[PDB]
Design a protein around this nucleic acid. Sequence first.
DNA 1: AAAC
DNA 2: AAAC
DNA 3: AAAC
DNA 4: AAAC
Lengths: 53, 107, 426, 106, 53, 53, 36, 36
Amino acid sequence: YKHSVPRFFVPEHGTMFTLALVRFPPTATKEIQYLNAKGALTYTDIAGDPVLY
Amino acid sequence: SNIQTGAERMPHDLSHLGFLAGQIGRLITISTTPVIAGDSFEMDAVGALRLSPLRRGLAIDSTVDIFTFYVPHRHVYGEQWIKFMKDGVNATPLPTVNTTGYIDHAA
Amino acid sequence: SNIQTGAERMPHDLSHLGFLAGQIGRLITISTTPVIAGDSFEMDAVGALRLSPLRRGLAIDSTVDIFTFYVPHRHVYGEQWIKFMKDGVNATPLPTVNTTGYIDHAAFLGTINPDTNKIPKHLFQGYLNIYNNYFKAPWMPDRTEANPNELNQDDARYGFRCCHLKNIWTAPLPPETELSRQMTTSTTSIDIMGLQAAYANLHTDQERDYFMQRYRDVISSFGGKTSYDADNRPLLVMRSNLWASGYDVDGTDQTSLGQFSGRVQQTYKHSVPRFFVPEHGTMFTLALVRFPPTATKEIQYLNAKGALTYTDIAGDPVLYGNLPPREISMKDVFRSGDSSKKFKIAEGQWYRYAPSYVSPAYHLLEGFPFIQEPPSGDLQERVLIRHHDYDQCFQSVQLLQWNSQVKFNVTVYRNLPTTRDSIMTS
Amino acid sequence: YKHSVPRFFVPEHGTMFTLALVRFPPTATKEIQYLNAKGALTYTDIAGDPVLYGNLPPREISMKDVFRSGDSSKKFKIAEGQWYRYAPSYVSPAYHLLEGFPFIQE
Amino acid sequence: RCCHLKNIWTAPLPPETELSRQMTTSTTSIDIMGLQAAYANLHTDQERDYFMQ
Amino acid sequence: RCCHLKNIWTAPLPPETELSRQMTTSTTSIDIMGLQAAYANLHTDQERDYFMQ
Amino acid sequence: KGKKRSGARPGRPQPLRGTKGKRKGARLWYVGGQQF
Amino acid sequence: KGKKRSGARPGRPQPLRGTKGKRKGARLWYVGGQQF
DNA sequence: AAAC
DNA sequence: AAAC
DNA sequence: AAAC
DNA sequence: AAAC
């Protein structure tokens, strides 16, 4: 990898902090599709009616 | 006596190696450089990112974010800093926060 | 219901007339326009500057300075303002400072005193910030009053006193300038290396004394910059400076034929180019009218301090370039100078400056704006202008020492709905 | 001055009336800026929030919110946000009862 | 006597401008459709008040 | 600890988002004009909740 | 930030003629109809 | 202010070779003479 | 904050 | 020894 | 702050 | 009446 910070004018005395964060997409082994897991489907949930939403 | 009242701005090489390690969703400081008013700063971090050996073959890439922020001291000491700069040489020395007695407790 | 959620930015004409009057060295607010975050502001002030009628013909032009500053409200209410904006509609209403019960006791803020006696704190505080960052001498203490009601009737009605234009006596080195510096040495040795260091520290002292009393200056010295937000200073948007003049009126009756009255009418124009308002605040416009500090009794330093030594008369560059500031008294430069009133001058200053000469025939002659007796008092009282020093210059009128009639053309490109979007429910 | 009426065809018998009106801008010696004279400032009064101004009823104000000797009992309905669409002229208090200025004194 | 040149104080909205408008509702329901209508009538009022006397 | 990459479950609306808003009405009338205003205020609330904290 | 000063507007003073800006915009007064 | 990310430096990792910057300047160590 |  |  |  |  390569992290490049272009020239920077320091206006007043301070610290320059450089931090790293490593993460994975939040894949759960048990997430269900909302429509597949909340009971009986009403018109509001299944139809995609723009005036309702 | 006459003293060395000036200085002329020239490039300062503050380069250094970094041997890092962290956990997965935690934000960790990997480098810090104290800067003076009026200096110009530039950096080129180039290295390798490794994960601990995994139990089976690769399945999903992880994403990595590297950030560089600037934090003026005024921002941190407020009024106290302002006064320090004004007071100059006999300013009261700046406050120092407390850590837990362990080698990695400020990591 | 559906509501009028947007607005489109269009020019707002906030133009208004200004009928002004003030004293000679006092800073007074002549116009203020409250601004909203994101608007663009522009102004064209065009009017005439008049002095009260003077007792004889014109002799010297006065100089006029008009200033426009921007003061963000955050700067004035701090944390409280931040929270107000965040809280939004149910934010707790903003604090209101207190005035003295008189019609002109808030005049310094260019406003009529409301019957309730209070005004928005931002109006009073903004003024103090402007004064303390650009008008007091760097070394005088800030003006820190909590409410306008703590002020005298002259500060409240006419504005705060400003300093005179720089002089040897009007602009001495800061009061605490050191004339010496000790290095505690040992009894029969000195540390050659400590001495060196001693000099490095004094340097650093000396600079803060003479040029960097303000934090923002210390940083520029490092070659860095500091935002107006960094030290909370009002931002100076525009400044106009001018000399006001006019003409003499010839008397023509039996007794006043040979007599004249100087009439100072000065057309001026103060233009503030477009300005983007980053956050809600007030736009303050102030005027200051001053005369060069001509005293009727200032003497040339070499002519008034006794016998002349080689150091004073020769102009030897090695001497002047190397000895401490010289402490002088009001008596070395004035005919009725208080020898007890001291001031620190740069060595050789007398060769870098020349006082104006007023022949003694003019000493108590009314109609000349000259300072008649040397200012008496501490350093601060002598540098701050005293408007009464000019009373015997003018005819006595109800409009103080100067009056102006201006037309503030101001355009703001703001984004609020139309006056009718506003009065129509749908 | 010169007042010119271009030719006009008179359709039926009548009078042609010509009138004059001389006026001065209404400069009062004691008008205050609304935000400077009505107490503590709320978010609605100071922020210039377009959704608020574009949606609430006319605001009822008194002669006292804009004048030094205003009768608090004398009310008037103003458009919300009007104070940001208008600016009064300023007359320094030194001019208050000074004769010779066509200002409205009280 | 003629009127002054327009001001905030010299040109206020007409005296009887309404600052509110009630719709007589029932005790535990409002008619969504009557409300709509309510607004249409006020509109018509409002215009006559402000611009069409 | 940092937050997860946005999800339906990982990035829900802020905790205190209001699901309703009452306008205190009178017993047998509602003020058509106050209602209007009611909506203007909620707007301002809603924006601070969702985008401007 | 501030700068050059200019009241040096060479001219005899002129009586103030009109408190209405330079560039106007939308309508501000609603009185029920036209009023001269 | 921050922006485009780039550790996408396509390459097999290379052992760290040298902790001395990219552009150097004046002399920093004084030890009494030359020292290898 | 895919905003009159 | 990034040196009058 | 007419500044190594 | 700076108006769907």
